[PDB]
Design an enzyme around this catalytic site. Structure first.
Site, PDB file in Angstrom:
ATOM      1  N   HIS A  24       0.810  -1.213   0.000  1.00  0.00           N
ATOM      2  CA  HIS A  24       0.000   0.000   0.000  1.00  0.00           C
ATOM      3  C   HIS A  24       0.844   1.264   0.000  1.00  0.00           C
ATOM      4  O   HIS A  24       0.467   2.255  -0.644  1.00  0.00           O
ATOM      5  CB  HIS A  24      -1.090   0.011   1.092  1.00  0.00           C
ATOM      6  CG  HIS A  24      -0.580  -0.110   2.493  1.00  0.00           C
ATOM      7  ND1 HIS A  24      -0.554  -1.311   3.171  1.00  0.00           N
ATOM      8  CD2 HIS A  24      -0.136   0.825   3.368  1.00  0.00           C
ATOM      9  CE1 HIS A  24      -0.088  -1.115   4.390  1.00  0.00           C
ATOM     10  NE2 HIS A  24       0.168   0.174   4.537  1.00  0.00           N
ATOM     11  N   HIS A  55       6.254   7.218   6.096  1.00  0.00           N
ATOM     12  CA  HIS A  55       5.731   6.772   4.815  1.00  0.00           C
ATOM     13  C   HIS A  55       5.022   7.953   4.203  1.00  0.00           C
ATOM     14  O   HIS A  55       4.887   9.008   4.835  1.00  0.00           O
ATOM     15  CB  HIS A  55       4.750   5.605   4.985  1.00  0.00           C
ATOM     16  CG  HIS A  55       3.592   5.930   5.877  1.00  0.00           C
ATOM     17  ND1 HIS A  55       3.654   5.800   7.245  1.00  0.00           N
ATOM     18  CD2 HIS A  55       2.369   6.444   5.599  1.00  0.00           C
ATOM     19  CE1 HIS A  55       2.509   6.194   7.774  1.00  0.00           C
ATOM     20  NE2 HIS A  55       1.710   6.585   6.795  1.00  0.00           N
ATOM     21  N   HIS A  97       1.728   9.310   1.335  1.00  0.00           N
ATOM     22  CA  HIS A  97       0.556   9.051   0.514  1.00  0.00           C
ATOM     23  C   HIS A  97       0.674   9.994  -0.673  1.00  0.00           C
ATOM     24  O   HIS A  97       0.997  11.163  -0.496  1.00  0.00           O
ATOM     25  CB  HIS A  97      -0.734   9.344   1.277  1.00  0.00           C
ATOM     26  CG  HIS A  97      -0.824   8.628   2.583  1.00  0.00           C
ATOM     27  ND1 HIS A  97      -1.423   7.396   2.714  1.00  0.00           N
ATOM     28  CD2 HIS A  97      -0.365   8.957   3.811  1.00  0.00           C
ATOM     29  CE1 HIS A  97      -1.337   7.000   3.971  1.00  0.00           C
ATOM     30  NE2 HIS A  97      -0.701   7.930   4.657  1.00  0.00           N
ATOM     31  N   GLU A 153      -3.650  13.496   2.194  1.00  0.00           N
ATOM     32  CA  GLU A 153      -4.775  12.985   2.968  1.00  0.00           C
ATOM     33  C   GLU A 153      -5.500  14.142   3.654  1.00  0.00           C
ATOM     34  O   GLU A 153      -6.699  14.371   3.428  1.00  0.00           O
ATOM     35  CB  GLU A 153      -4.266  11.958   3.962  1.00  0.00           C
ATOM     36  CG  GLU A 153      -3.768  10.716   3.238  1.00  0.00           C
ATOM     37  CD  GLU A 153      -3.915   9.470   4.066  1.00  0.00           C
ATOM     38  OE1 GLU A 153      -3.505   9.504   5.236  1.00  0.00           O
ATOM     39  OE2 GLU A 153      -4.438   8.464   3.542  1.00  0.00           O
ATOM     40  N   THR A 178      -4.717   6.477   9.335  1.00  0.00           N
ATOM     41  CA  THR A 178      -5.510   6.665   8.129  1.00  0.00           C
ATOM     42  C   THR A 178      -5.574   5.423   7.246  1.00  0.00           C
ATOM     43  O   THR A 178      -6.110   5.451   6.134  1.00  0.00           O
ATOM     44  CB  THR A 178      -5.016   7.856   7.306  1.00  0.00           C
ATOM     45  OG1 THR A 178      -3.719   7.564   6.772  1.00  0.00           O
ATOM     46  CG2 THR A 178      -4.967   9.128   8.149  1.00  0.00           C
ATOM     47  N   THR A 179      -4.987   4.340   7.739  1.00  0.00           N
ATOM     48  CA  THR A 179      -5.060   3.041   7.090  1.00  0.00           C
ATOM     49  C   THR A 179      -5.653   2.087   8.109  1.00  0.00           C
ATOM     50  O   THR A 179      -5.455   2.277   9.309  1.00  0.00           O
ATOM     51  CB  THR A 179      -3.659   2.546   6.703  1.00  0.00           C
ATOM     52  OG1 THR A 179      -2.842   2.558   7.870  1.00  0.00           O
ATOM     53  CG2 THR A 179      -3.019   3.476   5.663  1.00  0.00           C
ATOM     54  N   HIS A 194       3.951  11.139   6.489  1.00  0.00           N
ATOM     55  CA  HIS A 194       3.588  10.861   7.879  1.00  0.00           C
ATOM     56  C   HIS A 194       4.754  10.258   8.642  1.00  0.00           C
ATOM     57  O   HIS A 194       5.185   9.154   8.342  1.00  0.00           O
ATOM     58  CB  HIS A 194       2.396   9.890   7.949  1.00  0.00           C
ATOM     59  CG  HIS A 194       1.120  10.471   7.435  1.00  0.00           C
ATOM     60  ND1 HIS A 194       0.064   9.702   7.007  1.00  0.00           N
ATOM     61  CD2 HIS A 194       0.745  11.760   7.253  1.00  0.00           C
ATOM     62  CE1 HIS A 194      -0.913  10.491   6.597  1.00  0.00           C
ATOM     63  NE2 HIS A 194      -0.524  11.743   6.735  1.00  0.00           N
TER      64      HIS A 194
HETATM   65  C1  TE2 Z   1     -11.112  -0.818  17.181  1.00  0.00           C
HETATM   66  N1  TE2 Z   1     -10.437  -0.949  18.501  1.00  0.00           N
HETATM   67  C2  TE2 Z   1      -9.421  -1.799  18.778  1.00  0.00           C
HETATM   68  C3  TE2 Z   1      -8.729  -2.773  18.017  1.00  0.00           C
HETATM   69  C4  TE2 Z   1      -9.065  -2.978  16.674  1.00  0.00           C
HETATM   70  C5  TE2 Z   1      -8.572  -3.841  15.676  1.00  0.00           C
HETATM   71  C6  TE2 Z   1      -7.524  -4.789  15.798  1.00  0.00           C
HETATM   72  N2  TE2 Z   1      -6.886  -4.927  16.980  1.00  0.00           N
HETATM   73  C7  TE2 Z   1      -5.398  -4.721  16.936  1.00  0.00           C
HETATM   74  C8  TE2 Z   1      -4.969  -3.320  16.256  1.00  0.00           C
HETATM   75  C9  TE2 Z   1      -3.436  -3.329  16.030  1.00  0.00           C
HETATM   76  C10 TE2 Z   1      -3.003  -2.354  14.912  1.00  0.00           C
HETATM   77  C11 TE2 Z   1      -1.483  -2.342  14.633  1.00  0.00           C
HETATM   78  C12 TE2 Z   1      -0.981  -0.976  14.109  1.00  0.00           C
HETATM   79  N3  TE2 Z   1      -1.578  -0.633  12.799  1.00  0.00           N
HETATM   80  C13 TE2 Z   1      -1.090   0.237  11.893  1.00  0.00           C
HETATM   81  O1  TE2 Z   1      -1.664   0.463  10.827  1.00  0.00           O
HETATM   82  C14 TE2 Z   1       0.234   0.966  12.228  1.00  0.00           C
HETATM   83  C15 TE2 Z   1       1.022   1.450  10.986  1.00  0.00           C
HETATM   84  C16 TE2 Z   1       0.574   2.836  10.519  1.00  0.00           C
HETATM   85  C17 TE2 Z   1       0.872   3.951  11.292  1.00  0.00           C
HETATM   86  C18 TE2 Z   1       0.459   5.214  10.872  1.00  0.00           C
HETATM   87  C19 TE2 Z   1      -0.248   5.378   9.686  1.00  0.00           C
HETATM   88  S1  TE2 Z   1      -0.763   7.004   9.206  1.00  0.00           S
HETATM   89  N4  TE2 Z   1      -1.484   6.943   7.751  1.00  0.00           N
HETATM   90  O2  TE2 Z   1       0.423   7.902   9.142  1.00  0.00           O
HETATM   91  O3  TE2 Z   1      -1.716   7.541  10.227  1.00  0.00           O
HETATM   92  C20 TE2 Z   1      -0.540   4.257   8.908  1.00  0.00           C
HETATM   93  C21 TE2 Z   1      -0.126   2.992   9.326  1.00  0.00           C
HETATM   94  C22 TE2 Z   1      -7.214  -5.553  14.633  1.00  0.00           C
HETATM   95  C23 TE2 Z   1      -6.234  -6.551  14.496  1.00  0.00           C
HETATM   96  C24 TE2 Z   1      -5.330  -7.055  15.432  1.00  0.00           C
HETATM   97  C25 TE2 Z   1      -4.393  -8.063  15.138  1.00  0.00           C
HETATM   98  N5  TE2 Z   1      -3.487  -8.570  16.067  1.00  0.00           N
HETATM   99  C26 TE2 Z   1      -3.382  -8.094  17.529  1.00  0.00           C
HETATM  100  C27 TE2 Z   1      -2.679  -9.567  15.510  1.00  0.00           C
HETATM  101  C28 TE2 Z   1      -1.652 -10.336  16.068  1.00  0.00           C
HETATM  102  C29 TE2 Z   1      -0.980 -11.287  15.298  1.00  0.00           C
HETATM  103  C30 TE2 Z   1      -1.328 -11.479  13.961  1.00  0.00           C
HETATM  104  C31 TE2 Z   1      -2.350 -10.719  13.395  1.00  0.00           C
HETATM  105  C32 TE2 Z   1      -3.028  -9.763  14.162  1.00  0.00           C
HETATM  106  C33 TE2 Z   1      -4.172  -8.804  13.804  1.00  0.00           C
HETATM  107  C34 TE2 Z   1      -3.715  -7.857  12.682  1.00  0.00           C
HETATM  108  C35 TE2 Z   1      -5.405  -9.629  13.396  1.00  0.00           C
HETATM  109  C36 TE2 Z   1      -7.953  -5.372  13.297  1.00  0.00           C
HETATM  110  C37 TE2 Z   1      -9.384  -4.903  13.523  1.00  0.00           C
HETATM  111  C38 TE2 Z   1      -9.338  -3.633  14.361  1.00  0.00           C
HETATM  112  C39 TE2 Z   1      -9.088  -1.567  20.272  1.00  0.00           C
HETATM  113  C40 TE2 Z   1      -7.646  -1.139  20.544  1.00  0.00           C
HETATM  114  C41 TE2 Z   1      -9.437  -2.835  21.073  1.00  0.00           C
HETATM  115  C42 TE2 Z   1     -10.049  -0.449  20.659  1.00  0.00           C
HETATM  116  C43 TE2 Z   1     -10.260   0.252  21.853  1.00  0.00           C
HETATM  117  C44 TE2 Z   1     -11.236   1.247  21.920  1.00  0.00           C
HETATM  118  C45 TE2 Z   1     -12.002   1.540  20.792  1.00  0.00           C
HETATM  119  C46 TE2 Z   1     -11.790   0.842  19.601  1.00  0.00           C
HETATM  120  C47 TE2 Z   1     -10.817  -0.166  19.526  1.00  0.00           C
HETATM  121 ZN    ZN Z   2      -0.070   7.739   6.652  1.00  0.00          ZN
END
Ligand code: TE2
Ligand code: ZN
Ligand code: HG
Length: 257
Positions: free
Chosen positions: A61, A91, A93, A103, A195-196, A116
């Site tokens: 992406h 990174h 966009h 964005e 934003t992703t 970002h």
């Molecule tokens: C919604 N919600 C909450 C969780 C939601 C949730 C998950 N929980 C874990 C979220 C972890 C995200 C990691 C960081 N992500 C980035 O993108 C960083 C890079 C980046 C940075 C900056 C930019 S930019 N553009 O600059 O900004 C762009 C990109 C999900 C998956 C979790 C997995 N885990 C743990 C493992 C483990 C092992 C294997 C596979 C997995 C998966 C992936 C399945 C998917 C569904 C939604 C909680 C916190 C509970 C919450 C509390 C209160 C309200 C809501 C709420």
């Molecule tokens: Zn970004």
């Protein structure tokens, strides 16, 4: 899985990630005439002198330049932030054309791209824990316009040949992120999200007012990247931006008069 196309793009994200329609989603339009100067804002401190980049990755992406965050090296502090946030990655966009790609927007204006720089709060011990907190992340947003070349960006531009397709990565040590900053640190700040997907409403956004200029040939090279993996149909990596989201009566504050 999620992408930027007609079938997996921003309009579809809410099905896997309900928070896409939440109360503090990013990005947003910065209405300059609604944002208010905030005198309680402490001066912003961007300390990237001792920054330790490790590698660059095409993730299907965007590309992430990743940093060694196991010590208080590159840090963001001050401004609207309490405590210390560590640089983890940056990174971009960007768009298919110069008239789109950012964005965040400013009075509805879209820049050619947006950088970002992602930082996590050190009271939470690691990134994964930080992203479970409403104040876990700080993102420094810098607009890019097309003009003169950005010298400090060319080392990134030079390596993109090495990481054309999804999954590829290259050594990217001794990169200095200070080369990507504009002169002024005037900014808007509001509480928001990544934003992703999974999106995640853990970000204090600090969006710089002054854009950097990059050359047409620099942005052209961004556009030669691929969304697909090696040996797949070519899907040019362009228009990997989420459009502006409802403000929901959050307040955007200005660091400047
Ligand atoms: C919604 N919600 C909450 C969780 C939601 C949730 C998950 N929980 C874990 C979220 C972890 C995200 C990691 C960081 N992500 C980035 O993108 C960083 C890079 C980046 C940075 C900056 C930019 S930019 N553009 O600059 O900004 C762009 C990109 C999900 C998956 C979790 C997995 N885990 C743990 C493992 C483990 C092992 C294997 C596979 C997995 C998966 C992936 C399945 C998917 C569904 C939604 C909680 C916190 C509970 C919450 C509390 C209160 C309200 C809501 C709420
Ligand atoms: Zn970004
Ligand atoms: Hg959060």
């Amino acid at each position: 899985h999620w992408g930027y196309g007609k079938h997996n793009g921003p309009e579809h994200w809410h099905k896997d990630f309900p928070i896409a329609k939440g109360e503090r989603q990013s990005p947003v339009d910065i209405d300059t005439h609604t944002a208010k100067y905030d005198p309680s804002l402490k001066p912003l401190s961007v300390s990237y002198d001792q920054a330790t980049s490790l590698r660059i990755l095409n993730n299907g992406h965007a590309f992430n330049v990743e940093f060694d965050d196991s010590q208080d090296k590159a840090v963001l502090k001050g401004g609207p932030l309490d405590g210390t946030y560590r640089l983890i990655q940056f990174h971009f966009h960007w768009g298919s054309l110069d008239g789109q790609g950012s964005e965040h927007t400013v009075d509805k204006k879209k820049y050619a791209a947006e950088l970002h720089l992602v930082h996590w709060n050190t009271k939470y011990g690691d990134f994964g824990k930080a992203v479970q907190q409403p104040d876990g992340l700080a993102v420094l947003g810098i607009f890019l316009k097309v003009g003169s070349a950005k010298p400090g960006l060319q080392k990134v531009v030079d390596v993109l040949d090495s990481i054309k397709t999804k999954g590829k990565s290259a050594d990217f040590t001794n990169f200095d992120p200070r080369g990507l900053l504009p002169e002024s640190l005037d900014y808007w700040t509001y509480p928001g999200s990544l934003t992703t997907p999974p999106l995640l409403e853990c970000v204090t956004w600090i969006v710089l007012k002054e854009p950097i200029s990059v050359s047409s040939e620099q942005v052209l090279k961004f556009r030669k990247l691929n969304f697909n993996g090696e040996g797949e149909p070519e899907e040019l990596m362009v228009d990997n931006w989420r459009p502006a989201q409802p403000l929901k009566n959050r307040q955007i504050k200005a660091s400047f008069k």
